[PDB]
Amino acid sequence: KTKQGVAEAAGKTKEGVLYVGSKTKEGVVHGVATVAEKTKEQVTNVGGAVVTGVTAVAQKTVEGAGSIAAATGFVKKDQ
Amino acid sequence: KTKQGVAEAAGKTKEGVLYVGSKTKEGVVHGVATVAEKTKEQVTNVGGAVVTGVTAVAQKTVEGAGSIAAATGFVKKDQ
Amino acid sequence: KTKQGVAEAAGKTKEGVLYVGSKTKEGVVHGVATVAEKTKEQVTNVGGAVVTGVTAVAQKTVEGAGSIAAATGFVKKDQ
Amino acid sequence: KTKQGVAEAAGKTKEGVLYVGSKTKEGVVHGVATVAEKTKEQVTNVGGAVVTGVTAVAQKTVEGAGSIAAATGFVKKDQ
Amino acid sequence: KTKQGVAEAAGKTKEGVLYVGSKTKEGVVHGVATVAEKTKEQVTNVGGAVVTGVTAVAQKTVEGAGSIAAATGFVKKDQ
Amino acid sequence: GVVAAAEKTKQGVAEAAGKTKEGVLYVGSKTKEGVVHGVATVAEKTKEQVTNVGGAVVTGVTAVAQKTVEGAGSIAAATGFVKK
Amino acid sequence: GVVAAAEKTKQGVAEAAGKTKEGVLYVGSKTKEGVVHGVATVAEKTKEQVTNVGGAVVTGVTAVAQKTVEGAGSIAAATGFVKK
Amino acid sequence: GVVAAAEKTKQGVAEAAGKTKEGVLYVGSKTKEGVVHGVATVAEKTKEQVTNVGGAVVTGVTAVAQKTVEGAGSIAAATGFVKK
Amino acid sequence: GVVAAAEKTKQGVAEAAGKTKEGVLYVGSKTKEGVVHGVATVAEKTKEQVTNVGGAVVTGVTAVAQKTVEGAGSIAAATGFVKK
Amino acid sequence: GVVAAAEKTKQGVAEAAGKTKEGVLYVGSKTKEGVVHGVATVAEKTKEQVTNVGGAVVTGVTAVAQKTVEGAGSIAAATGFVKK
Ligand SMILES: Cc1cccc(C)c1NC(=O)Cn1nc(Cc2ccccc2)c2ccccc2c1=O
Ligand SMILES: Cc1cccc(C)c1NC(=O)Cn1nc(Cc2ccccc2)c2ccccc2c1=O
Ligand SMILES: Cc1cccc(C)c1NC(=O)Cn1nc(Cc2ccccc2)c2ccccc2c1=O
Numbered sequence: 161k162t163k164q165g166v167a168e169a170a171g172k173t174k175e176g177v178l179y180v181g182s183k184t185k186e187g188v189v190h191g192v193a194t195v196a197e198k199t200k201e202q203v204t205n206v207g208g209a210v211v212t213g214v215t216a217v218a219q220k221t222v223e224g225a226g227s228i229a230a231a232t233g234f235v236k237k238d239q
Numbered sequence: 240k241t242k243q244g245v246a247e248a249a250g251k252t253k254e255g256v257l258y259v260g261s262k263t264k265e266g267v268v269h270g271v272a273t274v275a276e277k278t279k280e281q282v283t284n285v286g287g288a289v290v291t292g293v294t295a296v297a298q299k300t301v302e303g304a305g306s307i308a309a310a311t312g313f314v315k316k317d318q
Numbered sequence: 319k320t321k322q323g324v325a326e327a328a329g330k331t332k333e334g335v336l337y338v339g340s341k342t343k344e345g346v347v348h349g350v351a352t353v354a355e356k357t358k359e360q361v362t363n364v365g366g367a368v369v370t371g372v373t374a375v376a377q378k379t380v381e382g383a384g385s386i387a388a389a390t391g392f393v394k395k396d397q
Numbered sequence: 398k399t400k401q402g403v404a405e406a407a408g409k410t411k412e413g414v415l416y417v418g419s420k421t422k423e424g425v426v427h428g429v430a431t432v433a434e435k436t437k438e439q440v441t442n443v444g445g446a447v448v449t450g451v452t453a454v455a456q457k458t459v460e461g462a463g464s465i466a467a468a469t470g471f472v473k474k475d476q
Numbered sequence: 477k478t479k480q481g482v483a484e485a486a487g488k489t490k491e492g493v494l495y496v497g498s499k500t501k502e503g504v505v506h507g508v509a510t511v512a513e514k515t516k517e518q519v520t521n522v523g524g525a526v527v528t529g530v531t532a533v534a535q536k537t538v539e540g541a542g543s544i545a546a547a548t549g550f551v552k553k554d555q
Numbered sequence: 556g557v558v559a560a561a562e563k564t565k566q567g568v569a570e571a572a573g574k575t576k577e578g579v580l581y582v583g584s585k586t587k588e589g590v591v592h593g594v595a596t597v598a599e600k601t602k603e604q605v606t607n608v609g610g611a612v613v614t615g616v617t618a619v620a621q622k623t624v625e626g627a628g629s630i631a632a633a634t635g636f637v638k639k
Numbered sequence: 640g641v642v643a644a645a646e647k648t649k650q651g652v653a654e655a656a657g658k659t660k661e662g663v664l665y666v667g668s669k670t671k672e673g674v675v676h677g678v679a680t681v682a683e684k685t686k687e688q689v690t691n692v693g694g695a696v697v698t699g700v701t702a703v704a705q706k707t708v709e710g711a712g713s714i715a716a717a718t719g720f721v722k723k
Numbered sequence: 724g725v726v727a728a729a730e731k732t733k734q735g736v737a738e739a740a741g742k743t744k745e746g747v748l749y750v751g752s753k754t755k756e757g758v759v760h761g762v763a764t765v766a767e768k769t770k771e772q773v774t775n776v777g778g779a780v781v782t783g784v785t786a787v788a789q790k791t792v793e794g795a796g797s798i799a800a801a802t803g804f805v806k807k
Numbered sequence: 808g809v810v811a812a813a814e815k816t817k818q819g820v821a822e823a824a825g826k827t828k829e830g831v832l833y834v835g836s837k838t839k840e841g842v843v844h845g846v847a848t849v850a851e852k853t854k855e856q857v858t859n860v861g862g863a864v865v866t867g868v869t870a871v872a873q874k875t876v877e878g879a880g881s882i883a884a885a886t887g888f889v890k891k
Numbered sequence: 892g893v894v895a896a897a898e899k900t901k902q903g904v905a906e907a908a909g910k911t912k913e914g915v916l917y918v919g920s921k922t923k924e925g926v927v928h929g930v931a932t933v934a935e936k937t938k939e940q941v942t943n944v945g946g947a948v949v950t951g952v953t954a955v956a957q958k959t960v961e962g963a964g965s966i967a968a969a970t971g972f973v974k975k
């Protein structure tokens with residue numbers, strides 16, 4: 161047997177109130193807040209990559225090798 | 240047997256209130272806040288990569304070798 | 319048997335209130351705050367990489383060798 | 398048997414209030430705050446790498462050799 | 477048996493209030509604060525690496541040899 | 556007077572404002588005003604006798620959460636002769 | 640007077656403001672005002688006798704959370720002759 | 724007078740402000756005002772006798788959290804003749 | 808007068824401000840004002856007798872957290888003849 | 892007068908400010924004002940008798956945390972004839 165990333169909860173009672181709960185989070189992006197007020201942005205681009213936004217990426221994979229989650233704002237000119 | 244990243248909770252009672260809970264977080268990005276007020280930005284790009292934004296990347300993988308989570312703002316010209 | 323990164327909690331009572339909880343955090347980025355007020359930025363880029371933003375990367379992997387979590391703002395020209 | 402990075406808690410009572418909790422943190426970046434006020438930045442880049450932002454990287458890996466968590470602001474020209 | 481980086485707590489009582497807790501921190505970066513006020517920065521880069529930002533890296537690995545956590549602001553031209 | 560001008564450009568923005576008053580903004584925030592969370596009570600054999608004559612009595616297991624803006628929040632108020 | 644000008648450019652922004660008053664902004668924040676959290680009480684054999692004559696009595700297991708802006712927050716108030 | 728000018732540029736920003744008053748900003752912060760957290764009480768055999776005549780009495784296991792802005796926060800107030 | 812100018816540049820910023828008043832900013836901070844944390848009480852056999860005549864009495868296990876801005880925070884106040 | 896100029900550059904910033912008043916900023920800080928932390932009380936056999944006539948009495952296990960800005964914080968106040 162093998163357990164990985166497992167949340168387990170067990171409870172037992174006779175009389176009263178019983179609460180049992182389990183939660184799991186794998187590859188989760190939570191709570192991203194961004195505010196821009198009275199911001200001046202001037203961009204001149206000639207054949208390049210410019211990124212000034214908000215990016216939130218969450219990736220979960222099983223048995224995956226060589227995977228890329230996020231590749232933002234790049235110039236790739238391989239031969 | 241083998242346990243890795245396992246959250247376990249157990250409780251037992253006879254009379255009263257019982258609370259049992261378990262939580263797990265693997266590859267989680269939480270609580271990213273960014274504020275830009277009265278900011279002046281001037282960018283001139285010629286064939287390059289410029290990144291001035293907000294990036295939040297969370298990646299969880301199993302049996303994955305050579306994986307890249309985030310690659311932001313790069314110039315790659317391999318031969 | 320083998321335990322790694324395991325959170326365990328156990329409780330027992332007869333009468334009253336019992337609280338049992340377990341939490342686990344692996345590869346977690348939490349609480350990133352950034353403020354820019356009245357900031358002047360001037361960037362001139364010619365074939366390079368410039369990064370002036372906010373980057374938050376969290377990566378969790380199992381059985382993964384040679385993995386890179388974050389590679390930000392680089393110029394790579396391998397032959 | 399072998400235990401590594403294990404948080405364990407056990408409690409027992411008959412009458413009253415019992416609280417049992419366990420927490421684990423592995424590869425966690427917590428509480429990063431950055432403020433820039435009335436800051437002037439002028440950057441001229443020609444084929445290089447310039448990084449003036451905020452970077453927070455957390456990586457947790459098992460059975461991974463040769464892994465790099467963060468590689469920020471570099472020029473690599475291997476032959 | 478072998479224990480490494482293990483936090484253990486045990487408590488027993490009959491009547492009253494009992495609190496049992498255990499915490500573990502491995503490869504954790506906590507509480508990084510940076511303030512720049514009225515700062516003037518002028519950078520001219522020609523084929524080099526310049527890093528003037530805030531970097532927080534936390535890496536936890538098991539059975540990993542030759543791993544690098546952070547490599548910031550370098551020029552590598554190996555033959 | 557407030558004047559903003561932009562002449563002979565390719566892309567131009569000219570904004571002029573006399574008086575400006577900003578307001579409140581909440582982006583990805585959580586608020587808790589007057590919140591009761593997680594109350595557990597266990598009673599086995601409780602004996603209670605109450606004799607109330609012209610008054611306010613609050614007994615037992617009571618959980619009250621109140622949020623008042625332009626008024627008063629009371630649990631037990633035994634008053635008299637409230638005028639105007 | 641407040642004047643902002645930008646002449647003979649490719650990209651130009653000209654902003655002029657006479658008076659500016661900023662406000663409150665909450666980005667990714669949490670607030671707790673008047674919050675009761677995590678109360679546990681165990682009672683086995685409790686004897687309680689209350690004799691109230693023209694008053695405010697609050698007994699038992701009581702958990703109160705109050706948030707008042709322009710008023711008063713009271714738990715037990717035995718007053719008299721409140722005017723204007 | 725306040726003047727800001729930018730002439731003969733490729734990218735130019737000209738901003739002029741007469742008077743500026745900044746406000747409060749909370750980015751990734753937590754606040755706790757009037758918070759009761761983690762109260763545990765165990766009572767086995769409690770004997771309580773209360774005789775109240777024209778007053779405010781608060782007994783038992785009491786947990787109160789109050790947050791008042793423009794008012795008074797009281798637990799037990801036995802007053803009289805409150806005017807204007 | 809306040810003057811800011813930038814002439815004959817490639818990238819230029821000209822900002823002029825007459826009067827500036829900064830405010831409060833909290834980035835990744837925690838605050839605790841009027842907070843009760845971690846109170847444990849164990850009572851086995853408690854005998855309590857209270858005789859209240861025109862007064863404020865607070866007994867038992869009491870945990871109070873108060874945060875008042877423009878008012879008074881009281882636990883037990885037995886006053887009289889409060890005017891204006 | 893306050894003058895800032897930048898002529899014949901490639902990248903230039905010219906900022907001029909007449910009067911500036913900075914404010915408070917908290918970056919990654921923790922504050923504790925009026926905080927009660929870690930109180931443990933054990934009582935086995937307690938005998939208490941209270942006879943209150945026109946006064947404020949506070950007994951038992953009491954934990955109070957108060958934070959007042961523009962007011963008074965009192966635990967027990969037995970006053971009279973409070974005017975204006
Ligand atoms: C809650 C409570 C219980 C028992 C004893 C008392 C004194 C209180 N407190 C208050 O009534 C507070 N109050 N007073 C007034 C004014 C007023 C009250 C009664 C009669 C005539 C005028 C009021 C008017 C308009 C909207 C709200 C309110 C308010 O909220
Ligand atoms: C809570 C409580 C219980 C018993 C004894 C007392 C004194 C209090 N406190 C208060 O009533 C505080 N108060 N007073 C007034 C003024 C007023 C009160 C009563 C009658 C006429 C006018 C008021 C008016 C408008 C909206 C709110 C309020 C308010 O909140
Ligand atoms: C809480 C309490 C219990 C018993 C005894 C007392 C003195 C207090 N304290 C207060 O009532 C404080 N107060 N007073 C006033 C003024 C006022 C009060 C009563 C009657 C007429 C005017 C008030 C007016 C408007 C909104 C709030 C308030 C407020 O909050």
Ligand SMILES: Cc1cccc(C)c1NC(=O)Cn1nc(Cc2ccccc2)c2ccccc2c1=O
Pocket residue numbers: 793794795796797800802805806807877878879880881884886889890891962973
């Ligand atoms: C808490 C308490 C209990 C019993 C005895 C006392 C003296 C106090 N303290 C206070 O009432 C403090 N106070 N006073 C006033 C003024 C005022 C009070 C009563 C009647 C008329 C005017 C007030 C007005 C407006 C908003 C708040 C307040 C406030 O908070």
Ligand SMILES: Cc1cccc(C)c1NC(=O)Cn1nc(Cc2ccccc2)c2ccccc2c1=O
Pocket residue numbers: 877878879880881884886889890891961962963964965968970973974975
């Ligand atoms: C707490 C307490 C208990 C019993 C005895 C006393 C003296 C106190 N202390 C205070 O009431 C302090 N105080 N006083 C005043 C002025 C005032 C009070 C009563 C009646 C008329 C005016 C006040 C006004 C507005 C907002 C707050 C306050 C405040 O907080």
